Amino acid sequence: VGLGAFILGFLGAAGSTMGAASMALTVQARLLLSGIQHMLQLTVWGIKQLQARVLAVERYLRDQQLLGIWGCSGKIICCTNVPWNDSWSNKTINEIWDNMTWMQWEKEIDNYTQHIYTLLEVSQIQQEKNEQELLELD
Amino acid sequence: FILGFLGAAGSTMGAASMALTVQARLLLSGMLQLTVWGIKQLQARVLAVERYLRDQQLLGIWGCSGKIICCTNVPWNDSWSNKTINEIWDNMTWMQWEKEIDNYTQHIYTLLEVSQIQQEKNEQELLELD
Amino acid sequence: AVGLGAFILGFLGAAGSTMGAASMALTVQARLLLSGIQLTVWGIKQLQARVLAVERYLRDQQLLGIWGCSGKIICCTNVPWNDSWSNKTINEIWDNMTWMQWEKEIDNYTQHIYTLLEVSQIQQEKNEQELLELD
Amino acid sequence: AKKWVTVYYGVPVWKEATTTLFCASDAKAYDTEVHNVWATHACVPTDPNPQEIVLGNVTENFNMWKNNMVEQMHEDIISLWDQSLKPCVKLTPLCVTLNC
Amino acid sequence: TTTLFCASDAKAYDTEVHNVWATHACVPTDPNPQEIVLGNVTENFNMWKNNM
Amino acid sequence: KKVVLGKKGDTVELTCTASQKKSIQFHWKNSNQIKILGNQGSFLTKGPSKLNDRADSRRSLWDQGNFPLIIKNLKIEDSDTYICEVEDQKEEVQLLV
Amino acid sequence: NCNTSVITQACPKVSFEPIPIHYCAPAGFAILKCNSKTFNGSGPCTNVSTVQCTHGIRPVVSTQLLLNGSLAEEEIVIRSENITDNAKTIIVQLNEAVEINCTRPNNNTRKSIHINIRQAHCNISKARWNETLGQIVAKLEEQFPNKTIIFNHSSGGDPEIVTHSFNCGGEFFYCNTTPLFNSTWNNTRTDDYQNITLQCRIKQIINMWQGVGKAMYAPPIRGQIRCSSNITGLLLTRDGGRDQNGTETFRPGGGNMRDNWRSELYKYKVVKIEPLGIAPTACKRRV
Ligand SMILES: *[C@@H]1O[C@H](CO)[C@@H](O[C@@H]2O[C@H](CO)[C@@H](O[C@@H]3O[C@H](CO[C@H]4O[C@H](CO)[C@@H](O)[C@H](O)[C@@H]4O)[C@@H](O)[C@H](O[C@H]4O[C@H](CO)[C@@H](O)[C@H](O)[C@@H]4O[C@H]4O[C@H](CO)[C@@H](O)[C@H](O)[C@@H]4O[C@H]4O[C@H](CO)[C@@H](O)[C@H](O)[C@@H]4O)[C@@H]3O)[C@H](O)[C@H]2NC(C)=O)[C@H](O)[C@H]1NC(C)=O
Ligand SMILES: *[C@@H]1O[C@H](CO)[C@@H](O[C@@H]2O[C@H](CO)[C@@H](O[C@@H]3O[C@H](CO)[C@@H](O)[C@H](O[C@H]4O[C@H](CO)[C@@H](O)[C@H](O)[C@@H]4O)[C@@H]3O)[C@H](O)[C@H]2NC(C)=O)[C@H](O)[C@H]1NC(C)=O
Ligand SMILES: CCCCCCCCCCCCO[C@@H]1O[C@H](CO)[C@@H](O[C@H]2O[C@H](CO)[C@@H](O)[C@H](O)[C@H]2O)[C@H](O)[C@H]1O
Ligand SMILES: CCCCCCCCCCCCO[C@@H]1O[C@H](CO)[C@@H](O[C@H]2O[C@H](CO)[C@@H](O)[C@H](O)[C@H]2O)[C@H](O)[C@H]1O
Ligand SMILES: *[C@@H]1O[C@H](CO)[C@@H](O[C@@H]2O[C@H](CO)[C@@H](O)[C@H](O)[C@H]2NC(C)=O)[C@H](O)[C@H]1NC(C)=O
Ligand SMILES: *[C@@H]1O[C@H](CO)[C@@H](O[C@@H]2O[C@H](CO)[C@@H](O)[C@H](O)[C@H]2NC(C)=O)[C@H](O)[C@H]1NC(C)=O
Ligand SMILES: *[C@@H]1O[C@H](CO)[C@@H](O[C@@H]2O[C@H](CO)[C@@H](O)[C@H](O)[C@H]2NC(C)=O)[C@H](O)[C@H]1NC(C)=O
Ligand SMILES: *[C@@H]1O[C@H](CO)[C@@H](O[C@@H]2O[C@H](CO)[C@@H](O)[C@H](O)[C@H]2NC(C)=O)[C@H](O)[C@H]1NC(C)=O
Ligand SMILES: *[C@@H]1O[C@H](CO)[C@@H](O[C@@H]2O[C@H](CO)[C@@H](O)[C@H](O)[C@H]2NC(C)=O)[C@H](O)[C@H]1NC(C)=O
Ligand SMILES: *[C@@H]1O[C@H](CO)[C@@H](O[C@@H]2O[C@H](CO)[C@@H](O)[C@H](O)[C@H]2NC(C)=O)[C@H](O)[C@H]1NC(C)=O
Ligand SMILES: *[C@@H]1O[C@H](CO)[C@@H](O)[C@H](O)[C@H]1NC(C)=O
Ligand SMILES: *[C@@H]1O[C@H](CO)[C@@H](O)[C@H](O)[C@H]1NC(C)=O
Ligand SMILES: *[C@@H]1O[C@H](CO)[C@@H](O)[C@H](O)[C@H]1NC(C)=O
Ligand SMILES: *[C@@H]1O[C@H](CO)[C@@H](O)[C@H](O)[C@H]1NC(C)=O
Ligand SMILES: *[C@@H]1O[C@H](CO)[C@@H](O)[C@H](O)[C@H]1NC(C)=O
Ligand SMILES: *[C@@H]1O[C@H](CO)[C@@H](O)[C@H](O)[C@H]1NC(C)=O
Ligand SMILES: *[C@@H]1O[C@H](CO)[C@@H](O)[C@H](O)[C@H]1NC(C)=O
Ligand SMILES: *[C@@H]1O[C@H](CO)[C@@H](O)[C@H](O)[C@H]1NC(C)=O
Ligand SMILES: *[C@@H]1O[C@H](CO)[C@@H](O)[C@H](O)[C@H]1NC(C)=O
Ligand SMILES: *[C@@H]1O[C@H](CO)[C@@H](O)[C@H](O)[C@H]1NC(C)=O
Ligand SMILES: *[C@@H]1O[C@H](CO)[C@@H](O)[C@H](O)[C@H]1NC(C)=O
Ligand SMILES: *[C@@H]1O[C@H](CO)[C@@H](O)[C@H](O)[C@H]1NC(C)=O
Ligand SMILES: *[C@@H]1O[C@H](CO)[C@@H](O)[C@H](O)[C@H]1NC(C)=O
Ligand SMILES: *[C@@H]1O[C@H](CO)[C@@H](O)[C@H](O)[C@H]1NC(C)=O
Ligand SMILES: *[C@@H]1O[C@H](CO)[C@@H](O)[C@H](O)[C@H]1NC(C)=O
Ligand SMILES: *[C@@H]1O[C@H](CO)[C@@H](O)[C@H](O)[C@H]1NC(C)=O
């Protein structure tokens, strides 16, 4: 968790715009990779803190595999082949990436997410069929 | 924990796959004695995670690293099993199927390793040209 | 994970073994493993060590994506070796040197190498996306 | 350029929750006073080293009259209350399930 | 360059100051410590540069 | 509007209803927005109304979702339209004494 | 047909003194807190922080005044769901506490008058009370700038809300607050001039606050009853109407325990994380 106040949501700080968070993340990633009075109740709190950490890990791993349904297994950032509709959003790339935070962005398209998720599933199914059909020849 | 797919082979293999697809869609679409038991429960959860991560990387030896379902290029031998795809997937549960072929697995595991080695060898030789 | 390391991290092999020997031992264990062939105070301390190691592991597995090695333990790249960093041959180092000896030998080139790896990955992604401009 | 869908995991976004909170208090656990007695079995000790993170330039909409923490606190207190200050005589209405 | 935990078989109730300090300064010792002998590794130690 | 009738000196019951079948905070008001009755927690509160002495409610039915206004000893001048506020719906009844 | 269900229970007395209780989110959840010193009852906060646990709140049960709790950081803040709604509770949080000292004298031993052990009283410092109201009025005038502010006693209802009510050590007290709310205001005070003494009675048959019903408690403790509380707020109800020609009246409200807890929990919100998001980019997946 290079960025963020939460274990999950590790791609950035709340309040940062989406583009800014990405740039900050790249820098932090580079640095990390490059290597650049006991109280009795402490027992209780130690367990609770570990449970929070363990739970985040369990969820993380679960989601990393579930995303395979859209062809995004094991990824944090996953590019797809589904076109963006101006109907979902009439904003352009720079204005959303530079001026909107992730919460604002999700609010902007909140009631289209179920539609988009459906489309992603469909695309992955067709991609899989195409590969296997080619392998019936090869 | 993974505990397989949590169905205890109480359903056939085909049914389990369909159920997983459904759940993946739903999931993505959206007191002194407590110290002792809290620790034991927590230890078990940690252990499950460590084994999972290890095995996902160990499977790289067969070219299946990081996958839950891994399609290989090793052909099926009717001698291992003479059943068809539908017979196996629709009528058998996982604990019935593994029993049917329980002692052919060591042979299969060997074949999987061999196939992966040959595939890697071929790719690297091609890359000495390209 | 694999009882060659003697540490939670550093699992590819025991300290003191040559790099080559460690790889061979690791292959053997993979086959064996896949083939199937005050207590409260210390319990918490042990778990903290294990949880932390897992978190670092996962973190790094994703951070390595920056060089195109996400999700890998062993990863091959397209950055050529500079004889200037090291004048030794492949069997020379893999057969006779341990990991610590090797890392000490090329320690001051590490940041140079890391920089090159990032640059290569950027160029690779750029090239692929340009091809996909038409394809 | 052509705009394409990209999926991101690890996005710093949150929604309102409806969950169960834990209570904590510095119960004496030897005293006979009601709140200490209840807390002894109902609650955990407080956090010896609490932390607070100030968020960046964010705006969050709060609403004290739609706050479900209130209802939960209400239930905990009633349970506490009725395990202690027991009346000599308790009288409550009860009606027949008729449509009248 | 890190911070280590102290551990001791403190009694506390004895009132002796090391036991009283230890009561909160430290934790109980490991009831079942383990040691791993490493392979043929040579390591340079220096007691005069030891930050512990 | 619902219309309820009675004679001077009589007693009538005007009602509000919740679909909740639970005790809900509710209020009764006259046409001049003067509070008459309401539910505060489990208690009956009365407003600064001419009906403060006449107004009552069957507290035992509050958990049935029934929130009546009972007006005893009706005066001819009590013939107003009373307003219910339950949950977030409003109801109106005209009383003719 | 409704039939009262009656349960007879043992009647022990117990020591009874509220302890601060903190609430903590479970794993997977976090609590956001509003850090504005001027925060409203609802709406945006720009200073927001994340905590795992709330501050402690003592589980104090009272009906007209909030007797033990936190204070506002700078100013008296008046919070209401709808200030123009005659039916809503107005919660006034003070930035300073007013001490109230209640007692049951050991010499009050009379048991009956004719065919006092239930007699008690509470003191408020006059200068604290008048200062408190003057500040409240100044804030009420921000909402009602052209109207006279009248404080008054309750308009009627069950005694638990008509009088002030609290519990010390199992003793249920009912106190007359007419002396606190008989004041009328302009930008100036209309009262006289040290100690405002409230008359209190200790009762055995009380209404339930936790539900609808009645409850009877054992008779009073022989002596030495004392309470020492910090008033940190008021529960007021505004009396409006079509004929309120230049005057607004504020009477003690309350009786709804949810309002008492809201007066402390207004700064906290519980949230969950949804880490999966979507946005357009200019990349394409190779297929
Ligand atoms: C807002 O928060 C504040 C917090 O500060 C709340 O204020 C607190 O309210 C408490 C309510 O009871 C009150 O508690 C009382 O304190 C008395 C004084 O305690 C101190 O002195 C004693 C002296 O020995 C010390 O031991 C103690 O540690 C303190 O230093 C206590 O004496 C009271 O206990 C007695 O009454 C309770 C009532 O339920 C009984 O349960 C308890 O068993 C005690 O009963 C004795 O008295 C009765 C009288 O008839 C006897 O019948 C009985 O047998 C006991 O008598 C024996 O002891 C007396 C002692 O003199 C002796 O004379 C007799 O002969 C017997 O031996 C009780 O603990 C807090 O003090 C008070 N805090 C402050 C600062 O004032 C405030 O209420 C909150 N607001 C709201 C709305 O909740
Ligand atoms: C606190 O609130 C109370 C309640 O509102 C308020 O006291 C009320 O003042 C009004 C002032 O008009 C009183 O109303 C009248 O008082 C006279 C006194 O003798 C009565 O005679 C009147 O009754 C006649 O007129 C009525 C008009 O409809 C007839 O219905 C009736 O049959 C009579 O003909 C009338 O009551 C009102 O009674 C008081 N209420 C109480 C409980 O005293 C009080 O002043 C407020 N406090 C402050 C500080 O302002
Ligand atoms: C916090 C605990 C840490 C996580 C616990 C699990 C960590 C993993 C421990 C064992 C990992 C070993 O996983 C290792 O994978 C690499 C490839 O990906 C394989 O290494 C492979 O290199 C190439 C092919 O990749 C070939 O030479 C040969 O097939 C094999 O040696 C090893 O066969 C396998 O042993
Ligand atoms: C929940 C358990 C606790 C830990 C969870 C797992 C740790 C993950 C947290 C950090 C994740 C960031 O890991 C991220 O990986 C992706 C690829 O996969 C990389 O993706 C990278 O793509 C290219 C570089 O090629 C850049 O345009 C981009 O800025 C960069 O993000 C990021 O450089 C790296 O920062
Ligand atoms: C948000 O509110 C917090 C809480 O008051 C402010 O930070 C505090 O500043 C005081 C000043 O002495 C410190 O003592 C506290 O420890 C600080 N608290 C925390 C949690 O840091 C904070 O500055 C406010 N932020 C904004 C943007 O107004
Ligand atoms: C206190 O609550 C009121 C009621 O919601 C807030 O008033 C609203 O403020 C927003 C801010 O942009 C306006 O758009 C709304 O139109 C306002 N509503 C009304 C009815 O005017 C008020 O701002 C809140 N005060 C604070 C400090 O947040
Ligand atoms: C509450 O305040 C009253 C104010 O009168 C106190 O009663 C006075 O106490 C003094 C103490 O010397 C006596 O001289 C006065 O004569 C008393 N006045 C009356 C009218 O009796 C009362 O004791 C205080 N009570 C509490 C709980 O503090
Ligand atoms: C309620 O009792 C408290 C405690 O005795 C009074 O406050 C004390 O007043 C004396 C007077 O000199 C001060 O020395 C103490 O320091 C005060 N105590 C505290 C905690 O401040 C309080 O004034 C009484 N309140 C009323 C209304 O009589
Ligand atoms: C509070 O006390 C006042 C008196 O101090 C009570 O009001 C008095 O009630 C009698 C009853 O006939 C009237 O004659 C007096 O004129 C009233 N006095 C005042 C100042 O109004 C009052 O009812 C008590 N209130 C409660 C809730 O007990
Ligand atoms: C009422 O408020 C007073 C302060 O106005 C509280 O007394 C202070 O509590 C703090 C807590 O750390 C102490 O450090 C101060 O020394 C106390 N002041 C005095 C004069 O004693 C008091 O405890 C509050 N009472 C209640 C019931 O909450
Ligand atoms: C908040 O605005 C200031 C203005 O300069 C900026 O520096 C800071 O980084 C912003 N915080 C976030 C989270 O963007
Ligand atoms: C997205 O564009 C396609 C192009 O024809 C259109 O059919 C579809 O309805 C669009 N989606 C929305 C939500 O408008
Ligand atoms: C939507 O896109 C069209 C494209 O020309 C633009 O004209 C229109 O103003 C956009 N609407 C909004 C609300 O941005
Ligand atoms: C971001 O908002 C500022 C506000 O003035 C605007 O000027 C800027 O052009 C916006 N960025 C983009 C990419 O539209
Ligand atoms: C999303 O909700 C808003 C709320 O009014 C609505 O106007 C908008 O059309 C909704 N969008 C979709 C895709 O349903
Ligand atoms: C697979 O089938 C072929 C068919 O001739 C047979 O020769 C071979 O031995 C079989 N392999 C195994 C492992 O049984
Ligand atoms: C085994 O496979 C052969 C292949 O032709 C088939 O004829 C035979 O019936 C199969 N036996 C069983 C039991 O399925
Ligand atoms: C499953 O068993 C039943 C039993 O008669 C059989 O009819 C059915 O065809 C079997 N299904 C498959 C896929 O073999
Ligand atoms: C598996 O075990 C059974 C037990 O009798 C045996 O008959 C069968 O031939 C074994 N199969 C293999 C592949 O060894
Ligand atoms: C240590 O030396 C012995 C001598 O035979 C050798 O067998 C062993 O493998 C060595 N261990 C390492 C780690 O080199
Ligand atoms: C790596 O080899 C290239 C080949 O021209 C050389 O220019 C470069 O300086 C070498 N790197 C170092 C560190 O010498
Ligand atoms: C590097 O290897 C070559 C091979 O002949 C050797 O001549 C050269 O001296 C070596 N470099 C150094 C610094 O010894
Ligand atoms: C390893 O060291 C021995 C020592 O005699 C040497 O003979 C051998 O050639 C070395 N191996 C390599 C690969 O240099
Ligand atoms: C690497 O460190 C060694 C230690 O003395 C030094 O001799 C060598 O020249 C260093 N190499 C570089 C490139 O700085
Ligand atoms: C309040 O004070 C002003 C000061 O001139 C006065 O005019 C006004 O009449 C006063 N209010 C009432 C109700 O008398
Ligand atoms: C409140 O009481 C103080 C006591 O001296 C007095 O000076 C002040 O003027 C009073 N408040 C008002 C508004 O008169």
Numbering used by the authors:
A (entry chain E): 513 to 548, 563 to 664
B (entry chain K): 518 to 547, 565 to 664
C (entry chain B): 512 to 548, 567 to 664
D (entry chain D): 32 to 131
E (entry chain A): 49 to 100
F (entry chain F): 1 to 97
G (entry chain D): 195 to 309, 325 to 359, 361 to 395, 397 to 404, 412 to 505
What did the published study say regarding this structure?
HIV fusion is facilitated by the viral envelope glycoprotein (Env), a trimer of non-covalently linked heterodimers (gp120 and gp41) (Harrison, 2015; Lee et al., 2016). Binding of the receptor CD4 to gp120 triggers a series of conformational changes, including opening of the trimer, exposure of the co-receptor binding sites, and rearrangements of the gp41 helices (Blumenthal et al., 2012; Harrison, 2015; Ozorowski et al., 2017). The N-terminal region of gp41 forms the fusion peptide (FP), which becomes sequestered during the initial steps of receptor binding by moving toward the trimer interior (Ozorowski et al., 2017). Here, we identified a pocket in gp41 of our previous cryo-EM reconstruction of an early pre-fusion intermediate Env (CD4 bound and co-receptor mimic antibody bound) (Ozorowski et al., 2017) that is proximal to the FP and contains a bound detergent molecule used during cryo-EM grid preparation.
